[PDB]
Ligand binder design. Structure first.
Ligand code: XHW
Ligand code: XHW
Ligand code: BR
Ligand code: BR
Ligand code: CL
Ligand code: CL
Ligand code: NA
Lengths: 306, 304
C-alpha cells in the first residue's frame, strides 16, 4: 500500500552526466557513446541571448573551445555540430557507462523522471509531467541547463527532455534529445510566456482508480455520464478534454476495479462540484494530475483492496 | 525556481541491491563489501511468523540454506549471523560497487530517500519522512522487504532504514541497518498498529520558508509570537512542540529570507486557526511537513 511520486532509479543516467564549458559558460551535458549532447545556448554570452544567430556564433568556435569534464577526467572534443537547439560534441572516448537507451518525444500528459544536475554532478531526482501548455513544473536553479528527463521502463532509458530555461512564471521549458522544443518556446530571450495551463484529466482519473485499488471509494456516486457531457463540464474547470484514446488507456484500471470509465468520470464531475469536504485522497487535498494510467499500473498492486 | 519532493540520486545504492532467498522466501538485501544485510524474517515460513524464536530458527540454518543473487551472478554464502532484526550473510565476493557509507539511525522528523526494490532489482525512488509515530508513509508491495532508505552527503551514503513490514493502516515499519526497529514494532505476525501521529512543526516552518523563497508570501503578517504561546497552539492542533533547537536549525532559512522564526510562527499560528481561505502554498492545500530545513536549503541552493 501507499502511493508516492515515484521516480525511476537514476543511476543509469547519473553515469552519463558531464560538465560542458564554452568560454565563461558552464552547463551540463549528456554523454552517450562518443557524443555529448547539451543546449546550444552554451555558446552564447548574456548579450547574445536577445537575438543570437547560432550559425554565426558556432562557426567562430573550434573543437578546443569546448571543455568537457566527466568526473575528474577531461574528454577531448573531436567534432561538433548543431541539431535544432542541441549541440552534439563528438569526443574521443565512448562512455563506458552508456546504458541501453533511446530518444522519445513525448506528448502532453506524459510523465518522466528528472535528474537535476549542476556542474555535471547530480543533485536530486523527482517526477514531472509535460503540461498541456508544454512547460514542466520542475525545480531548477542557475546552472541546471542540460539536466535531462527520462523513463526507464524495461531496462532501457528513454530520454525525453533536456532543460533549457525558466519562464517568467517559474515553470520550465526545454527540448527533446533531437533539440526540438516542446511548445512554441525558443532559445532566445523573447517575451514568451507559458499559455494558460489546464489539468490533465486522464491522469486525474487514473489517480482516482489508484485510490480505489488502494481501498477507498467514498467519492464514487450512482451516476454515469456521456463522454460529451463530461467534457462540457470538465472544460468549465479548465480540465483537458477526455478523448476515446484516454478512455481506452484507462481500460485496465477500469477492469481491475470494476468501475466503468464513464462512471469514474461521473465521480470526477461530482468532486469538481463538491470538493473533498475535509477528506483527502491518497494523502492529497487537491485532485492530482501528474500520475498517468501507466504510472498507476507501475506502482499499484494488481489486486484491489475490496 | 520551483519546489518538488526531491530524492537523492540513487545510483550508489542501486549497485548494492541483491536478491536473498531462504527456502521459498525471497526478498532484497544490501551488499556492502563482503556482507549482505537483509531482514531476519527471511528465515521464517508463514507459520513461523506467528511466534518465531529467531535464535532457534537460525540455529537450524546453515550457509547453504541462503541463496544470494546479484544480477545474473550467484554469490556463495560463507557465514551468517544476526544483529538485532537484521541477518548478515558473509559472501565470497566483495561488492566492487560498494560506495563510501555509514549506518546512521535517524530521529522522527528526518527525511530520507527510499529505493523500492523487488527481486533484488530497483524499481523506484521516492522521498519519505520518519513520522513522529515512527512509521513511514512509503509505497511498498509484496516482495519489497529489504528495500532501504538513505541520505547522501558529498560521496557518503548514510543508510538509515531497511523495510520490514506494512501495518494495517497501510503505513510501513522497519529498522536501522543495525537491525533496531524504529517504533514499538516487532517482526512477528501479531496485532500491531500505528499510534496517533502528529505533524512535524519544524518541517512545516521550513516549507513556509521555501514558499517565501519561491515568492508565495500571502500568509505573512505583522505579528510575532513567543515560543510558549506558539506551543500552546501547536498542542491544540496536534503539532509537535517547537524547541529552541528547532529555532536554531531554522537559522539558515531565517537568514536567507530575513524572516525571524517567531515571525513565521505567527503566520503558522494564523494558518492553523483560520485555514488557507481557499488559497494554496507551493501548490498545496495542506501544510506540508516532509521537508526538513536542510532539504529546503539543499534544493534552493543546488547542492550536489
Ligand atoms: O541556468 C539557467 C537557469 C535554468 N533554469 C532555471 C533557472 Cl532559475 C536558471 N539559465 C542560465 C542562462 C541561460 N538561460 C537560457 C535562456 C534564457 C531565457 C530564454 C531562453 C533561454 Cl535558452 C537560462 C537560464
Ligand atoms: O513483502 C511484504 C510486504 C512489505 N511491505 C508491504 C507489503 Cl503490502 C508487503 N511482506 C512479505 C511477508 C513478510 N512480512 C513480515 C511481517 C508481517 C507482519 C508483521 C511483521 C512482519 Cl516482519 C511482511 C509483508
Ligand atoms: Br504582535
Ligand atoms: Br494538497
Ligand atoms: Cl510524494
Ligand atoms: Cl521503452
Ligand atoms: Na508575522
Amino acid at each position: 500500500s501507499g502511493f508516492r511520486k515515484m521516480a525511476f532509479p537514476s543511476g543509469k543516467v547519473e553515469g552519463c552526466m558531464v560538465q560542458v564549458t564554452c568560454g565563461t559558460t558552464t552547463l551540463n551535458g549528456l554523454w552517450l557513446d562518443d557524443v555529448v549532447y547539451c543546449p546550444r545556448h552554451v555558446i552564447c554570452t548574456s548579450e547574445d541571448m536577445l537575438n543570437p544567430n547560432y550559425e554565426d556564433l558556432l562557426i567562430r568556435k573550434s573543437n578546443h573551445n569546448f571543455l568537457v569534464q566527466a568526473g575528474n577526467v577531461q574528454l577531448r572534443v573531436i567534432g561538433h555540430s548543431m541539431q535544432n537547439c542541441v549541440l552534439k560534441l563528438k569526443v574521443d572516448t565512448a562512455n563506458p557507462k552508456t546504458p541501453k537507451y533511446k530518444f522519445v518525444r513525448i506528448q502532453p500528459g506524459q510523465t518522466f523522471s528528472v535528474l537535476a544536475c549542476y556542474n555535471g554532478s547530480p543533485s536530486g531526482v523527482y517526477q514531472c509531467a509535460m503540461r498541456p501548455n508544454f512547460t514542466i513544473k520542475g525545480s531548477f536553479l542557475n546552472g541546471s541547463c542540460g539536466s535531462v528527463g527520462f523513463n526507464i521502463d524495461y531496462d532501457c532509458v528513454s530520454f525525453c527532455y533536456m532543460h533549457h530555461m525558466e519562464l517568467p512564471t517559474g515553470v520550465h521549458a526545454g527540448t527533446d534529445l533531437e533539440g526540438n522544443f516542446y511548445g512554441p518556446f525558443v532559445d532566445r530571450q523573447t517575451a514568451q510566456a507559458a499559455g494558460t495551463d489546464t489539468t490533465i484529466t486522464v491522469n486525474v482519473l487514473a489517480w482516482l482508480y489508484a485510490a480505489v485499488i488502494n481501498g477507498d471509494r467514498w467519492f464514487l456516486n450512482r451516476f454515469t455520464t456521456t463522454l460529451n457531457d463530461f467534457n462540457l463540464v470538465a472544460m468549465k474547470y479548465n480540465y483537458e478534454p477526455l478523448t476515446q484514446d484516454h478512455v481506452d488507456i484507462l481500460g485496465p484500471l477500469s477492469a481491475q476495479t470494476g468501475i466503468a470509465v464513464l462512471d469514474m468520470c461521473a465521480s470526477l464531475k461530482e468532486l469538481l462540484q463538491n470538493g473533498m469536504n475535509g477528506r483527502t485522497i491518497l494523502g492529497s487535498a487537491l485532485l492530482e494530475d501528474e500520475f498517468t494510467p501507466f504510472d498507476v499500473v507501475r506502482q499499484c498492486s494488481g489486486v484491489t483492496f475490496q
